[PDB]
Design a protein around this ligand. Structure first.
Ligand SMILES: Oc1cc2c(cc1O)CN(C(=S)NCCc1ccc(Cl)cc1)CCC2
Ligand SMILES: Oc1cc2c(cc1O)CN(C(=S)NCCc1ccc(Cl)cc1)CCC2
Ligand SMILES: Oc1cc2c(cc1O)CN(C(=S)NCCc1ccc(Cl)cc1)CCC2
Ligand SMILES: Oc1cc2c(cc1O)CN(C(=S)NCCc1ccc(Cl)cc1)CCC2
Lengths: 394, 394, 394, 394
């Protein structure tokens, strides 16, 4: 539809025109959208014809705005249009805020079990392990199999995500970040299961990365808290901007001076590349040692290089990072609030695709009528209107 | 009154209309408020009818503006209105600046005694302790009983605060912060008295938290110094904003990677959760050790996790904190000055509720007359006016 | 020409007038520049007479704008003029982006060879060294002679740069920075060759500085990536501004308090100037020790000086640096983007001076005609036009 | 004069009116100030009657503007007025820039001698010391007596400064900061001489503070370099603002938690107040140890206090400092440039009070005439004009 094409392109005012058109005329009130049926004292209650929600149409409007390729003009502004911008706010505060707190209650109990199942792993060699008859490790084995079940669940739900939309590996990390991470978490969980029954001890590597990834995915549920949520968006957008560009520059100076200080070292402990690449990394933390070796010639060469390193990377790049974060904070400061708004909207749509077997609340704010007039006949039983309200504005 | 209701709602211009109305008309100069009785050369001296100060009315205006729920429109701007905004400035520089410096002189001597009484506590077991006949520890015992007396005084004064206003546990930490802290300080002081006579050595835990809390409550008296005071407001508003949101994100990455590095550790010293949760906390300070253990398998897994931790939390979150403080400084930069202004106003009102037995200075800047005309008769002895002054403005 | 003189002075609107003049008139369309030959529906295709590119004229326009002394009015804005500003964009995306990625592929393989040739240097004394008959060190000797060849190549190319332009030692470090560094890198490489055959072991000092300089010159190729490139310009402009001014102030406080703490030290390890000038430098990193010696008198004097040092330089200058970077970031934030644009332009011009033996692509976007009218006769075969395009603008 | 009273009050436009008045009229060109005697093509050369420089009048204008109490309206803007603002620029670039570089060349050689005289002090007890007949320590004794001579010179020049102006102990540290420091440096130098002949070894305390103070006074000569000079003004204004207010807040939390952690410590090394007040100070540097003692009860109490300390002062105050510096940088960013301008002006005036015995250059840019007309008679030999020049402005 040209409605959906105005959305799927991102033409912003056109969509404001369509969703709010007004006509008090015979054979044309059936052409109008915004039905100001209660124009009482200053609150202007209005009703909206609502072919936009996904329960109405197939390939409907909100799924179009939410699932876009993020190369559109302003996808983060088309949710601000007055019929939609309270329809989600209704659906959240009425319906999905209950079930969203539920999953975050489940997922917090998923990680605590997966924590304690890993914290009390057995130390003896050769996996897998015969469960002892003591009543303690039955909790371990139940804790083990519960935690694998989450790795199963996030595996299919990661797939049946991607088996729908197919973001084609360029929109994948671009917009659908932190949906990859739940898949990658589950992916490490299954490789840990594979090696646990293929008897090799290296499963616990895969268990560990599945666990550190898992706790950091508890930042996902900071959406649904607009204080925390907009904050966590900035943490995403600083990683995808100030780590691909910062850590290239830092690794040049690191791996540059780390190489120049190897070849100066004649022999001894730090004569490998790796063991001195830590020792120059410790300067960045704040544990750098200036006299961390002596087995070389030309001490003046050695301490010019450390001082050329520490000046360039500790007091100059790491302070340049704090600047360029702060200069890029103010730009993101309003745009990230928009990205929060859209991420809640995806969670709202994702649950109606989930909670479809109980779809009595799938409609929003009216299904009866607001028209009562059509050129083809009666219109007092259709157009499934949404009751709204308004302010004074004198 | 509609005057008080304009204040208690926070309607800002309405209150500017009421406190400054002007009428030079028969039967209506008794209806006017602002009496420009000396409209001389450019300084325009004026007198104000003053039913606003608390000595005039019951449930009067300044107590309404000060004790609000902070969900009002602009409580921090209704003190800027010209009759009030110099009336407090008069009351401070005339009356309460003397007594405010007194209490801060007392409280500084309260803490020094409570310091030295704790610094010279006896080391021998089994509290309480028989006072030796040497003349030294009589100063200790007097120092002990003086310091408990402050714990008594701040206990009732914390209660008889709350027994008046009842901020109902939501406005409590919101606006009446740093009045809780004096109550919590005294609360730890009394539990320390309880355990000191119930013979258990754990009283000194309660003494210590009563002491660290006590010295940090010496920031309370930075109000009354507009240099220091506005500064200390920013320290409050960054804690109540950038610690509930920062320390959630930090504790995720901490307790995430702290768990992932436990289960990698096979056995030894750091195989507990707590002992490695310090070792990852030391990276935040600047004392983090990269090779702080060796008793594991898969060294590459271990040092990916530290490097994934240090990149994410030491060079990225802790620099993001400095950004988001600075982006939120400029917003607070003017608003905190308003919050300082209102906190002085509460201290001004709180002392007239205290120093009521000597209430000769409880009136402000005139009680005689400025009207001399009323429709009901004479008006040359009432309306308790406040003498003001003005500038040129050509 | 007055065209070139408008460029070489930096008069900005004059150059916009010349490169875009329009005339539809007999005996005067041969005087016009901008030939709007396809004024179709909203895209306005236009053709440009193009005496500006260096293949047309000797001492031509882009070489004038690029090779300026940087004391001009806005050299970083004269490349924004519509004929040029897409002509380079054409030449990059058509021609030189291929060869620029090639050299950065070569130079990355140059450094890896020069890395491994240094990483596996022999430890035995008395250079030079007889190559063993084992097949391993033939890779070393080939790696050695390949790496010297780069030192030869960057030596002449550094000279035949300077043998052209002669920036006269004031414009040298000012604008032609990071062209010096490739010369200085090669310069250390040759001194390393000299000492390697003059049998003294101090060649490896010169090898090392040639190597740390070499990896940091891999930041040169961040131009050609507008994300990374504008970022790396800021790293240049903060060094040439906030190191000549910061490190003077820091070295005053360093060498001040380092001297005042020597003379307090009576005898022992740290009684030299250098050994305590490190110990006060360690405070800047985060490894400063407050009790790092005891062999003095007047401990209170010693720890006042450290605390006077640490207050003044660790919590006050190093936080002042982060401020004054960030206050100077916003000023540079747009200007550095312009300096990136001009640095790409120099690389574009530098390759046509290089790739001249294959100059079939040396022309840009047309050589045939756009005029077809002249007062002296025919004009349908000259003026070597550049086909452009445009937008709608209603 | 009303001219001087317009300056000494700081009325800014009035002074612009007086110094630039124009009259082409009989009996009134002798009343005019700005004589536009060469109104040629676009450069408008002009001459100025110049009763403003101190060689003309007693209690003259520049000494009034420079020596103000800094409670004036805009003392940092009255030097921007067109006759003055190039007159100092003339006097600097013609006359005093030569002698200013001289003193900074002397003072740099003063400190190097005073450095080496202290660096090679004798270690043997009981001052003073018999000079050995070896030729080495004659350089020491000459170095000693040269360095005392600077302590003599800065003593009187510090006094005969103050014996003129008498800033009355409130304007002293306010505006005449870094003139105190040269007096305090010399003051420590003389006390070091006193104790060196009163045979007590504690002179070297006074020598040391005289030396660390001395090198940091080499920041004084950063005026005269407008790059470095404006930078060094910011270092002054951040100390006098963000140390009286920061270090109060920090010392509360320091001395608060340092006391609360003493009384928890039962006995041992750190059971003194001072020895643990360092250990909590080390957290601010980056060398804080969390397990720095064990001799207590209630470990959980001990590490809550460190973590309550480190959260509050290391990641929260020290990041709040970087914010509030940067928010106060932008405000100072233009005002400090004005304070630089005025500090050069004081140095210009201070040398004519010094170099008065050679006062042939004490006049500025003309003494002959520009009037040639007066109501009382001839005016072709007075009013000591200053030749200026101008720009085009079409
Ligand atoms: O919306 C989201 C935000 C965030 C996350 C997830 C969201 O859905 C978590 N996150 C994480 S875990 N970054 C780190 C990845 C990582 C972890 C461990 C290893 Cl060993 C290697 C790499 C990054 C940003 C915060
Ligand atoms: O207006 C006020 C401002 C301030 C305060 C009081 C005011 O009235 C003091 N303050 C403190 S003490 N924060 C820390 C609380 C704390 C202390 C110790 C422990 Cl072991 C646990 C928690 C926070 C902010 C500064
Ligand atoms: O455009 C460019 C940017 C950059 C560079 C080159 C460019 O062409 C590299 N660079 C370097 S290497 N700075 C350090 C110099 C240095 C290195 C080692 C020693 Cl021992 C002494 C001095 C500085 C800035 C980054
Ligand atoms: O215009 C000027 C600027 C500056 C200065 C002098 C100027 O004339 C030097 N300065 C110094 S030395 N601050 C520190 C004082 C100090 C030193 C040592 C001890 Cl042990 C105790 C106190 C502060 C600011 C920089």
């Amino acid at each position: 539809t040209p409605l959906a094409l105005a959305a799927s392109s991102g033409k912003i005012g056109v969509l404001a025109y369509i969703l709010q058109r007004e006509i008090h005329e015979p054979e044309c009130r059936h052409l109008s959208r915004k039905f100001t049926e209660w124009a009482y004292g200053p609150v202007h209650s209005s009703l909206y014809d609502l072919s936009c929600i996904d329960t109405c149409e197939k390939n409907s409007v909100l799924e179009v705005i939410a699932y876009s390729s993020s190369e559109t003009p302003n996808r983060h502004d088309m949710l601000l249009v007055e019929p939609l911008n309270r329809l989600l706010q209704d659906k959240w505060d009425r319906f999905v805020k209950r079930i969203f707190y539920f999953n975050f209650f489940v997922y917090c109990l998923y990680m605590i079990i997966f924590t304690a199942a890993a914290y009390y792993r057995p130390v003896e060699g050769l996996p897998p392990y015969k469960l002892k008859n003591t009543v303690g490790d039955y909790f371990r084995v139940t804790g083990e199999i519960l935690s694998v079940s989450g790795g199963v669940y996030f595996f299919f739900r990661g797939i049946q995500y991607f088996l729908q939309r197919r973001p084609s590996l360029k929109s994948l990390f671009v917009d659908s970040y932190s949906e990859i991470l739940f898949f990658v978490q589950s992916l490490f969980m299954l490789v840990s299961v594979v090696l646990y029954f293929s008897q090799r001890k290296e499963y616990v590597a895969s268990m560990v990365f599945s666990l550190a990834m898992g706790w950091t995915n508890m930042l996902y549920y900071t959406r649904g808290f607009q204080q925390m949520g907009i904050y966590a968006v900035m943490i995403e957008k600083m990683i995808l901007r100030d780590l691909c560009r910062f850590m290239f520059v830092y690794l040049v100076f690191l791996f540059g001076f780390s190489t120049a200080v190897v070849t100066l070292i004649e022999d001894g402990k730090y004569n490998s590349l790796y063991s001195t690449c830590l020792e120059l990394f410790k300067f960045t933390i704040g544990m750098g040692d200036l006299e961390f070796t002596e087995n070389y010639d030309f001490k003046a060469v050695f301490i010019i290089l450390l001082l050329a390193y520490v000046i360039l990377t500790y007091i100059l790049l790491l302070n340049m990072l704090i600047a360029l974060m702060g200069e890029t904070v103010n730009k993101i400061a309003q745009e990230s609030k928009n990205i929060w708004k859209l991420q809640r909207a995806i969670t709202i749509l994702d649950t109606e695709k989930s909670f479809l077997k109980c779809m009595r609340k799938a409609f929003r704010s009216g299904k009866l009528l607001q028209v009562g007039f059509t050129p083809d006949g009666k219109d007092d039983y259709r157009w499934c209107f949404r009751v709204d309200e308004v302010n004074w504005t004198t």
